[PDB]
Design a protein around this nucleic acid. Structure first.
Lengths: 215, 174, 122, 37
RNA sequence: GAACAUGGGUGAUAAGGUCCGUGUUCGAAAGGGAAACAGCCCAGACCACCAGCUAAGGUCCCAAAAUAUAUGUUAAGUGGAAAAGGAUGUGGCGUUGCCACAACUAGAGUCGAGUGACACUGCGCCGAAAAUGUACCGGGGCUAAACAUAUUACCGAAGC
RNA sequence: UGGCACCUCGAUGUCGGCUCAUCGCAUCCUGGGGCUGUAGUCGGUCCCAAGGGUUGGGCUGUUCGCCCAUUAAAGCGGUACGCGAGCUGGGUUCAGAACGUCGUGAGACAGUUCGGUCCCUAUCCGUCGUGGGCGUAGGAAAUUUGAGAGGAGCUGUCCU
RNA sequence: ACGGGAUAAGUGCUGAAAGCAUCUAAGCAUGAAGCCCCCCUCAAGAUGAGAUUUCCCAACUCGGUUAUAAGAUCCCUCAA
């Protein structure tokens, strides 16, 4: 049900209804090819594999991730295509169609269709307790020695240990988050880009998979 | 102990045949229904099933009055077929039918719909009222009762739809 | 952004000159309020003559604040002071005159009687 | 209904039968009616 | 000096309270049973053994020995935690009496088969609300692997 | 509020408030009801229901308590009267003073009032993050099934 | 803020102890912000170590020592 993979480019704004201002996120979805599919007889569930950007050659003197390896190259030769960089699975779409080896599209979604965006977060690293969580700080005057720090972490003799999940200082980092109820304002087929009304998680030039509002 | 030798007839448009733990009433009156009547020692000799199973167990005297009546209500309501009337207390019930989906109204901004099942006939001589039929009171009954209790009739001032006739607790205030 | 303990300049002819908001009615937890909101305040400075006296608890709708008010077209509008009009608990002004301009957000707040005396309506 | 431990057949119209845990009473008037508490 | 069982005072026929009297155990006592538990039940270790018989308590699995036999009682998981009361609960003990009592009705006539107060009971039922987590059968689990009797068999200590 | 004196005097070191919680039901709000001396809105007593909510100020140090203005509501409790090797030091509660009653006097009463040093580099368990080693009957790379575990859950007004 | 599967106080139906009558002795449809499912994140150290596609393959002699192959790193220029 309209499954594709894109890459966050930046952000901007456009005008639509009479004179309303709507901020959008420029997503760039280029060459998208479908790989091997999974059936309920062999695998055990219905799902289709899809690649993204292509790489160079393989089996040479490369040491970076720019070139592919025998394993990947060999698995990409079965679909009669080039080695991809990003690979994901869509078990929410139909497996009856999407002939293996054939590419996807970019005009599959029509302006006004509800979609769901998914991706990793930015990342801040080791954070505090009033930053990672919504905790408040203590007084800064009246001879106080308690500022940006956590308070009590348990009772007294009731329990001689700390309960699991006490919201202690840690590393925020970036976990995979999904945003629902997202609409498509426009869809360009010349530059193969999609305009989503709102903001998606992740930094610049980052992976971002789109789907269809399951509701 | 309660009702021991109350061996009554089975003069039917039907017959009874016993193999399992039950009966089955095939008759032009009502064609081929039954549940499992009784895991008691059930006989049916020349016309009827009045089988002297239970005695000397406290459970047995309610088992008698229950399972002679599982057989009894089944065979009769599937032979006889008897649902009585319901009431029309007020102004402005919109009584009708749409197959197996009737209609009324109570004074809701939105008449909410109710639909029923078959094997309990949807019988409508009803213009602001209810009066239905079917075969087995076990299956016309709970529906003769979902229809009882739509807007529980004004226990002060008259409006509602209800059963064949009683008194309601009629209350007064300022 | 009009929170608790804030002095505003009433732009009416009732008899008040300055009031101090006591509570921003609107819900449990409400802190601030923008143009098109009702707040409960008290007269801190009045004038010899009128119906409202000093030390009276009355209601009023804040109109034209220092903070901006974003629209739907992407345009903003901010004044150089924070004013307000005293109501009569019926979406109606206690006075009959209004000084200074007003915003066009009172029309959506069912205040057609307050946007019929204001000289300008930006 | 009412709820007190001392249920009985209350007036000269209410009479009792055992239910699951309640030995409550059935009759013609909702001013004499009780279930064990 | 302490608890347990009895006989009293004092306090509130309150306290793991406090003071006397008569016993036993701990103190100064290991071993077996009470899930773990100085004071409760059985019993007093001189040393060796890959011998045998018993005590309290026990015999479906954890975990040694009956998924033993005969008879009743119990439908709550009662067993496996409280009381005044309450009642168409009941297996046993005595009544009382219509040959009607379930659909009769005064606020009168039938048909077909059990009705009840009262009295002593035995086992149940409701009365029954607490703070980290099932949460007193020790756990899995049991309609007998529960209770009241009888007779047996066998297991069981550093006792003989 | 008390009674008893069983653990701690080679130290179990502090009442409110701040910060952050978690559990209960004897239910403040929301919900599902029979019943009202419930027509309707409303509201009174009872039954079931513990998921999530449960406001900012003025006044003495107040755990209390009255008042102002709101809110769907501003419930009652347990957790060393939760939490000082997380904070404050106002209240108690040390050496200086003043008044009042009492004492021959040194003083006492806590009756009031003003001023008065809050120490510690985290070994073990616990909790919040993040790596190294080996295991899975050949070795390696990439995409995955989900037995389990956590998070979420509230509510108002207008057009009709 | 939705949609299911059960249920608790109530509500009637089948139908009784004790012949008439109770929602219980067997069954029954209803039935709540509660409980399972559905939404989102982590999940085979789930030693019960799962599954799918692709890549790699030996001389000694099988004391296994020597070894290479797919791949992985050390080292260097860097930041989503």
């Amino acid at each position: 049900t309209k499954g594709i993979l894109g890459r966050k480019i930046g952000m901007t704004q456009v005008f639509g209804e009479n004179g309303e201002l709507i901020p959008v996120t420029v997503v760039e979805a280029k060459e998208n090819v479908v790989l091997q599919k999974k059936t309920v007889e062999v695998d055990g569930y219905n799902a289709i594999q899809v690649g993204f950007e292509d790489k160079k050659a393989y089996k040479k003197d490369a040491k970076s991730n720019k070139y592919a390896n025998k394993p990947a190259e060999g698995h990409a030769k079965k679909a009669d295509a080039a080695p991809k960089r990003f690979i994901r699975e869509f078990r929410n779409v139909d497996v009856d169609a999407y002939e293996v080896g054939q590419e996807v599209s970019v005009d599959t979604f029509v302006a006004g269709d509800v979609i769901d965006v998914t991706g990793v977060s930015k990342g801040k690293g080791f954070q505090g307790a009033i930053k990672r969580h919504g905790q408040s700080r203590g007084p800064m005057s009246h001879g106080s020695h308690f500022h940006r720090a956590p308070g009590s972490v348990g009772m007294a003799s009731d329990a001689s240990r700390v309960f699991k999940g006490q919201k202690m200082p840690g590393r925020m980092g970036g976990n995979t988050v999904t945003v629902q109820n997202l609409e498509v304002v426009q869809v360009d087929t010349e530059n193969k880009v999609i305009l989503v009304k709102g903001n998606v998680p992740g930094p610049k030039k980052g992976l971002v998979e789109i789907r269809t509002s399951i509701k | 102990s309660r009702v021991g030798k109350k061996i009554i007839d089975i003069p039917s448009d039907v017959t009874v045949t016993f193999d399992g733990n039950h009966v089955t009433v095939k008759g032009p009156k009502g064609e081929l229904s039954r549940t499992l009547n009784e895991r008691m020692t059930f006989k049916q000799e020349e016309n009827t099933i009045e089988v002297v199973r239970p005695s000397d167990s406290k459970e047995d005297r309610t088992n008698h009055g229950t399972t002679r009546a599982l057989l009894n209500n089944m065979v009769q309501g599937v032979s006889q077929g008897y649902v009585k009337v319901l009431e029309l207390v007020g102004v402005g019930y919109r009584a009708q039918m749409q197959g197996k989906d009737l209609i009324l109204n109570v004074g809701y901004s939105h008449p909410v719909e109710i639909k029923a099942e078959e094997n309990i006939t949807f019988s409508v001589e009803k213009n602001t009222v209810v009066k239905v039929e079917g075969i087995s009171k076990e299956q016309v009954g709970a529906l003769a009762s979902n229809i009882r209790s739509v807007r529980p009739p004004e226990p002060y001032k008259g409006k509602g739809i209800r059963y064949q006739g009683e008194y309601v607790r009629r209350k007064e205030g300022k | 952004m009009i929170q608790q303990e804030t002095r505003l300049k009433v732009a009416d002819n009732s008899g008040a000159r300055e009031v101090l908001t006591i509570k921003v009615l609107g819900g449990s937890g409400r802190k601030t309020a923008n143009i098109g909101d009702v707040i409960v305040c008290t007269v801190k400075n009045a004038t010899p003559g009128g119906v409202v006296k000093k030390g009276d608890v009355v209601k009023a709708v804040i109109v034209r604040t220092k903070s901006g008010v974003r629209r739907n077209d992407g345009s903003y509008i901010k004044f150089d002071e924070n004013a307000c009009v005293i109501i009569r608990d019926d979406k109606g002004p206690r006075g009959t005159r209004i000084f200074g301009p007003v915003a066009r957000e009172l029309r959506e707040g069912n205040f057609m009687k307050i946007v019929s005396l204001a000289p300008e309506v930006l | 209904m009412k709820v007190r431990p001392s249920v009985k057949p209350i007036c000269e119209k209410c009479k009792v039968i055992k239910r699951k845990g309640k030995v409550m009473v059935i009759c013609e008037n909702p001013k004499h009616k009780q279930r064990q508490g």
